[PDB]
Amino acid sequence: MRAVVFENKERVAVKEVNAPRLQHPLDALVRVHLAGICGSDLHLYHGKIPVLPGSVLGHEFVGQVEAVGEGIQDLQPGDWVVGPFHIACGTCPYCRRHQYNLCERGGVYGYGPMFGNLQGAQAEILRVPFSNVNLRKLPPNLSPERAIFAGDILSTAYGGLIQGQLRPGDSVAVIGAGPVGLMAIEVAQVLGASKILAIDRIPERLERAASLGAIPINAEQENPVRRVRSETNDEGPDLVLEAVGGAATLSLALEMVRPGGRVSAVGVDNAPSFPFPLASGLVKDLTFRIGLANVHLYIDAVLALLASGRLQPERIVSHYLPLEEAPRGYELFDRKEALKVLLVVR
Amino acid sequence: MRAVVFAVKEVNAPRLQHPLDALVRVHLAGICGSDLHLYHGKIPVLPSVLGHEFVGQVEAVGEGIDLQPGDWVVGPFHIACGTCPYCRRHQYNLCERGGVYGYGPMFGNLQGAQAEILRVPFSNVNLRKLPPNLSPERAIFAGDILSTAYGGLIQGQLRPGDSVAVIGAGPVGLMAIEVAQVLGASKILAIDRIPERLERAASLGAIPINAEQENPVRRVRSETNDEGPDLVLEAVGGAATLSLALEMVRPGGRVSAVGVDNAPSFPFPLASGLVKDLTFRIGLANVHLYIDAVLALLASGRLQPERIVSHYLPLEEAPRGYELFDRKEALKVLLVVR
Ligand SMILES: NC(=O)c1ccc[n+]([C@@H]2O[C@H](COP(=O)([O-])OP(=O)(O)OC[C@H]3O[C@@H](n4cnc5c(N)ncnc54)[C@H](O)[C@@H]3O)[C@@H](O)[C@H]2O)c1
Numbered sequence: 001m002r003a004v005v006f007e008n009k010e011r012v013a014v015k016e017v018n019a020p021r022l023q024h025p026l027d028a029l030v031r032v033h034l035a036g037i038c039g040s041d042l043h044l045y046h047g048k049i050p051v052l053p054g055s056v057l058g059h060e061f062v063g064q065v066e067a068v069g070e071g072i073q074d075l076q077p078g079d080w081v082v083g084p085f086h087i088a089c090g091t092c093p094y095c096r097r098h099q100y101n102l103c104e105r106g107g108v109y110g111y112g113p114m115f116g117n118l119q120g121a122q123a124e125i126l127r128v129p130f131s132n133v134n135l136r137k138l139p140p141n142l143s144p145e146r147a148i149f150a151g152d153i154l155s156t157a158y159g160g161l162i163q164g165q166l167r168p169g170d171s172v173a174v175i176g177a178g179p180v181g182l183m184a185i186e187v188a189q190v191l192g193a194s195k196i197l198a199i200d201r202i203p204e205r206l207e208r209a210a211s212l213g214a215i216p217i218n219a220e221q222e223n224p225v226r227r228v229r230s231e232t233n234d235e236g237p238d239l240v241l242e243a244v245g246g247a248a249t250l251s252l253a254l255e256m257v258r259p260g261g262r263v264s265a266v267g268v269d270n271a272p273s274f275p276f277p278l279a280s281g282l283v284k285d286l287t288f289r290i291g292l293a294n295v296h297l298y299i300d301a302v303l304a305l306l307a308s309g310r311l312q313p314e315r316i317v318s319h320y321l322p323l324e325e326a327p328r329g330y331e332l333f334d335r336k337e338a339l340k341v342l343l344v345v346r
Numbered sequence: 347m348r349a350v351v352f353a354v355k356e357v358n359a360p361r362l363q364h365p366l367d368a369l370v371r372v373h374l375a376g377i378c379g380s381d382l383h384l385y386h387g388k389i390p391v392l393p394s395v396l397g398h399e400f401v402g403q404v405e406a407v408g409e410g411i412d413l414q415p416g417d418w419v420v421g422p423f424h425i426a427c428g429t430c431p432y433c434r435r436h437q438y439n440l441c442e443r444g445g446v447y448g449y450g451p452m453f454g455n456l457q458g459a460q461a462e463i464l465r466v467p468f469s470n471v472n473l474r475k476l477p478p479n480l481s482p483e484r485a486i487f488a489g490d491i492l493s494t495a496y497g498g499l500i501q502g503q504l505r506p507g508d509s510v511a512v513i514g515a516g517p518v519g520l521m522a523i524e525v526a527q528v529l530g531a532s533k534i535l536a537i538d539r540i541p542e543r544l545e546r547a548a549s550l551g552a553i554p555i556n557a558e559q560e561n562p563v564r565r566v567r568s569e570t571n572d573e574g575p576d577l578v579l580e581a582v583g584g585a586a587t588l589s590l591a592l593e594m595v596r597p598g599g600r601v602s603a604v605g606v607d608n609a610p611s612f613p614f615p616l617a618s619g620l621v622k623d624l625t626f627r628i629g630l631a632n633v634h635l636y637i638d639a640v641l642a643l644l645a646s647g648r649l650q651p652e653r654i655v656s657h658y659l660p661l662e663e664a665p666r667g668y669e670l671f672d673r674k675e676a677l678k679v680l681l682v683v684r
Pocket residue numbers: 038039040152153156175176177178179180181199200201202205219243244245248249266267268269291292293
C-alpha cells in the first residue's frame with residue numbers, strides 16, 4: 001500500500017505500508033479514490049495532537065468497496081461510498097441517543113492513539129469498522145469530488161447551522177472563511193438566510209466568501225462587531241457560527257450575536273477555558289453550543305443536497321495532487337497557499 | 347397606599363396613564379431570592395417600592411382592555427410591550443420597553459408589587475385571569491419562580507425518562523424539582539448545603555446531596571451510570587455553581603442556568619468542552635411564553651407550589667420577613683396585604 005505517514009513535527013512522507021485486512025464481520029475495505037487534507041490535519045502536523053511515527057494520516061475519503069464482512073447486507077464490492085471522519089458503534093448508549101460523535105467505542109481515522117488509534121485515509125485502502133453505521137452508498141448521479149465533503153467539513157458546517165436553529169429569514173455571522181466557514185456560507189444561503197457575514201483576515205478567502213453571497217469583513221482592518229451590528233439593525237445576527245477555534249473568536253461570537261440569539265462553536269483549540277459573560281449573559285439571553293461534529297446525524301440530508309446540485313462544495317478545491325505529492329500539499333495548505341487540497345490516489 | 351420600600355411607609359397610589367393600563371389591588375405579594383440581591387449591596391435601588399411577585403384583583407382598566415374590576419389576576423414579574431421586534435419573536439424578556447417591577451433603575455425603574463396597588467402597563471400582555479377554581483396563593487407562583495423553573499426545564503429540553511440535576515434547593519430549585527417530576531423525569535438530584543432545604547427537596551422526590559459534606563460531581567455521576575444527568579438546572583448564581591453544572595452534566599447533555607449573579611464572567615471549558623459537546627443557556631425568564639401552560643397545570647392540581655410557603659405575614663411585618671428569608675429561617679415568605 002502506498003500511504004502518507006507522519007515522521008515528526010512538520011514532516012510527512014509517502015511510504016509503503018501493509019494493506020489492512022477484514023478483522024470483524026461488520027468491517028469493509030475501501031479502495032480510496034480521493035483523500036482530503038483537513039484543517040484538523042494541521043494540528044497533527046504541528047504536534048498539537050499526539051501521533052506515533054509511521055502512522056497513516058487522513059480522515060477525508062471517497063472510494064469503492066473492495067470487500068465486506070459476513071455481516072454486511074447493503075454494500076457489495078463495486079459500490080461507491082463515503083463515510084464520516086469519525087466512527088461509531090451503533091449500540092452504546094450514546095449511539096442509541098443518536099449522538100454518534102460521543103460513541104464509547106468512538107474514534108477518528110488517522111488521528112493517533114488518543115482517538116481510537118485508527119489507520120488513516122490518505123492511502124490506497126481503508127478499513128472501516130461497523131461499516132453498517134459508518135458508510136453511505138453514493139446516490140447514482142453524484143461525483144466523488146463533490147461527495148467527499150459530506151464525510152467531514154460540509155456536514156460539520158451544516159450540523160453547526162442546524163443545531164444553531166437557523167431558520168429562513170435569519171441573519172448569520174460566520175467567523176472563519178477557511179473551508180469549513182465556506183461550507184457554512186453556502187449552506188446558510190440555501191437554508192434561506194436573509195443576510196450572511198463572513199469575518200476573516202485573508203483577502204483571498206474573503207473574496208471567496210463574497211462570491212458565495214456573504215458580506216466580507218476583514219478583522220485586521222476594522223472592528224467586526226461594530227460592522228456586523230450596523231448590518232443587522234444594530235442588534236447583531238440571529239446566529240453566529242464560529243469556525244476558527246480559540247478564546248479570541250469565541251468572545252467575539254458572544255459579543256457579536258444579538259440578544260436572544262444563538263452561537264454555534266465548531267472550531268478546535270487547546271486552551272482549557274475562555275471567559276463566558278455572566279451578568280451581561282443573563283441580560284442578553286444566550287444559547288451556546290460547542291462540540292465535535294455529529295456527522296452521521298446529517299450525512300443523509302447532505303448527500304441528497306449534493307446529489308441534487310443545491311450545494312457545490314468542490315468549487316473550493318484549489319489543488320488536486322497525486323498521492324506522492326502529499327508533502328507539498330501539506331506545505332501549501334499549512335502556508336495558506338492552497339485553499340483545499342484533494343489527493344488523487346491511483 | 348401602604349407599601350414596602352428600600353420598611354413600610356405611605357406612598358402615593360398610582361393612576362391609569364394609558365388605554366392598556368390596569369390597576370391591581372394586590373392581595374398577596376412575595377419576597378423572592380432576587381429581592382435578596384437588592385437587600386444586600388448587589389443591585390442598585392433608589393432609597394422606592396420593592397417586589398415583583400403578586401396576585402390580586404383588578405381595580406380599573408384603560409379604555410382599550412377581557413378584564414373587569416372583579417377579576418382575579420396574576421402577571422409576569424417582567425413587563426413587555428407586545429409589538430417590538432423581540433416581542434414579535436416571542437422573546438418577551440428582551441422587550442425593548444421591558445422592565446422588572448420594583449427592581450430599580452437598571453430594570454425599567456418600576457414601582458414594586460409589595461404594595462396595596464400595582465399599575466400594570468399593557469395589561470393585555472402582562473396579565474392573566476385566574477381560571478375559576480384556582481387559589482390566589484397557588485396562582486401567584488405562575489408570575490415568577492414556577493415559570494422561571496418551568497421555562498429553564500423546557501428550554502433545557504427535558505424529555506421523559508431524562509435524569510436531572512438541580513443546583514440550589516431554594517424556592518426556584520424546589521419548583522424545578524416538582525416540575526421535573528411531572529414532566530416524567532426518571533431521577534432528579536438536588537444539590538444544596540442546607541439540611542432543611544434538602545429535606546424539602548427529598549419530600550418532593552429528589553435525591554438530596556449536601557455539597558458541604560461530599561463531592562456532588564462524584565455522587566451525581568454514580569447516580570447516573572457514571573455519565574452524569576441529561577440536564578442540569580443551575581438555580582443559585584455565580585461561577586462556582588456554573589462550573590459545577592458544566593462538570594456534572596453528561597457529555598452531550600444540556601445546562602440551563604437560571605441563577606442571578608453580578609460577576610462579569612466565568613471560565614467555560616473549551617478543549618474539554620469540545621470533547622464533551624455541551625449546550626448551555628443563561629438568561630432571565632421568559633415568563634409570558636410559559637404562564638398559560640403553568641396556569642393550566644396549577645388549576646388542575648398537578649402542581650402545588652404553595653406547599654413551600656413557610657410564612658404568611660402581614661404587610662407591616664415585611665422587615666422581619668426579609669430577615670427571616672435572608673437568614674434562611676423562612677423558606678418562602680408571602681405578604682398578606684388588604
Ligand atoms: N467540530 C468538528 O468536529 C470539526 C470538523 C472539522 C474541522 N473542524 C475545525 O474547524 C476549523 C476550520 O477548519 P478549516 O479546514 O476551515 O481550517 P483552516 O485553518 O484552513 O481555516 C481557518 C480560517 O480561519 C482564519 N482565521 C484564523 N485566525 C483568525 C482570527 N483570529 N480572526 C479571523 N479569522 C481567523 C484563517 O485565516 C483561516 O482562513 C478548524 O479549527 C478545524 O480543526 C472542526
